[PDB]
């Protein structure tokens, strides 16, 4: 948590006006009025990393929901677990009227 | 004594010089910051001369026919970069070379 908080601090202390000179703008003969088609490439990466670091708990929650809902059905969806005599015997024992 | 500490970076030395240049014209009043600033300047100039002499001795006594292998140099460059920008170097990256 300390490492993650430090990284988020560093990301948030960046400037907003964070254009990037791409060295391929040579072939795009910019005339001081046009807009470079790659000014926002480091800004987009900074935003992506920051937001992904801020949505960590949401990913954790969805992951644990997926894991729980796929584990609860192990004995019904996985063949070598569903076909052992012990799991079959237990599932039969539950249904004894 | 007072013993103003050694400047950590070059900006600190620049601000030391600025402070000295501001203080100069009131020596009978300050009389104590000037001496510490000048001792620091003496130490810095001494270190610079020693560094120049050691660099001269180093560059003229390197080796006759030694060379650096490219693989190791590339690994060292990448590791230096990673360590410089606070990322992590995997454990199998330096012990094995």
């Amino acid at each position: 948590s300390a490492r993650i908080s430090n990284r988020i601090n560093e990301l948030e202390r960046l400037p907003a006006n964070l254009g990037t000179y791409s060295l391929d703008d040579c072939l795009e003969f910019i005339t001081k009025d046009d807009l470079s088609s790659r000014m926002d490439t480091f800004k987009i990466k900074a935003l992506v990393e920051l937001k992904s670091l801020k949505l960590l708990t949401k990913q954790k929650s969805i992951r644990q929901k997926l894991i729980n809902n796929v584990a609860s059905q192990a004995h019904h969806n996985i063949p070598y677990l569903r076909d052992s005599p012990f799991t079959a015997a237990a599932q039969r024992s539950v249904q004894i009227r | 004594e007072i013993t103003i500490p050694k400047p950590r970076s070059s900006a600190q030395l620049e601000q030391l010089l600025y402070r000295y240049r501001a203080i100069q014209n009131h020596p009978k009043e300050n009389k104590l910051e000037i001496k510490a600033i000048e001792d620091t300047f003496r130490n810095i100039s001494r270190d610079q001369d020693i560094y120049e002499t050691k660099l001269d001795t180093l560059r003229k006594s390197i080796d006759k026919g030694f060379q650096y292998d490219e693989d190791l140099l590339n690994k060292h460059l990448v590791a230096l970069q990673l360590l410089e920008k606070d990322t992590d170097v995997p454990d199998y990256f330096l012990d094995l070379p």
């Binding site: 490492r3 993650i4 990284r7 992904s52 670091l53 949505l55 960590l56 990913q59 | 990322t87 992590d88 995997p90």
Partner: peptide, 13 residues
């Protein structure tokens, strides 16, 4: 599938 946290988990352990 997004390696959001892998670097820090790896460097701490």
């Amino acid at each position: 599938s997004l390696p959001i946290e892998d670097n820090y988990i790896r460097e701490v352990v």
